[PDB]
Amino acid sequence: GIEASYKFLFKVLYNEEVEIEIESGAGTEYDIIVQSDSLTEDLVGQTIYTATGRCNVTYIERSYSNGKLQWTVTIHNLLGRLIAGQEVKAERLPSFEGEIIRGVKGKDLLQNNIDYINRSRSYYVMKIKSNLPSSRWKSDVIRFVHPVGFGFIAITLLTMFINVGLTLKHTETIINKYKNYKWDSGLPTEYADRIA
C-alpha cells in the first residue's frame, strides 16, 4: 500500500513503468501570498483552484500587511501556471473564496489550464498512469495495493526507443596528390616523362 508498492508492483508484475498520481506527491514547496480572512484552516491539505489547476496546502501561516492578514499557505505542487490574479475556489470547500495569488509555477498540458472539463467529485481521487492497457492491470492492483473504497482515473502513455546514430558513421577518408600549374616555374629537374 505504500506508493513504492504501486511502482514496484508492475516491475515484478509487468516489468514496465507505471506512475500513480497523488496530489501531495514528491513535489513540495510554495510561492504566492494569500489575502483571506480567518479561513477555517481545515482546508490545509485540501486543494483549491484557478483555471490553471488545483493543488493541496499542507498548512498556512498568515502575517500582517495593512492589517488584513496575509495567508501564506504551503502547497505540494502546481497544476497549470499560476497568475497574480486568478479565479480562486477551494477544491474541498464551496464556501471559501481566496485572494489573487502572487507567485507562479506551471503544470504543462496540451490545452493548458482553462476549466479543463468534467472534473469529478473533487476529481482528485488519485490518478494512475502506465503504458500497459487497463483490465490487464485493473483487477490485480486493487487485488494487491490499490485500496478498496477508492476508484482511480487512468491516463496512458508511451515512449519509443530508437537508434539513429549506430547507422551513422564515417565510411572512409581519402586524399590526392596533385601538381598545380601556376606558371611561375622553370623546368629544370628531369624532363619529358609523361607525354600525351
Partner: protein
C-alpha cells in the same frame, strides 16, 4: 511529542491527523511539523497524505 494522537475524518479521504504536544510548548512548533512530516513522508499509503 509527549503523546501523538492519530485520527482522521471520513468526510475528507486521503488524509491523516495526529495530535502532538511538543511538551516544550502548548502548541507544537512548526520546525518540527516540517521536520516530522518529512521524515514521516517515507511511509505514506499512496492514496493517503498524512497531515
Amino acid at each position: 511529542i509527549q503523546a501523538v494522537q492519530t485520527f482522521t475524518d471520513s468526510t475528507k479521504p486521503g488524509y491523516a491527523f495526529i495530535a502532538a504536544k511538543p511538551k516544550s510548548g502548548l502548541y507544537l512548533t512548526t520546525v518540527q511539523r516540517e521536520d516530522i512530516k518529512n521524515y514521516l513522508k517515507d511511509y505514506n499509503l499512496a492514496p493517503i497524505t498524512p497531515s
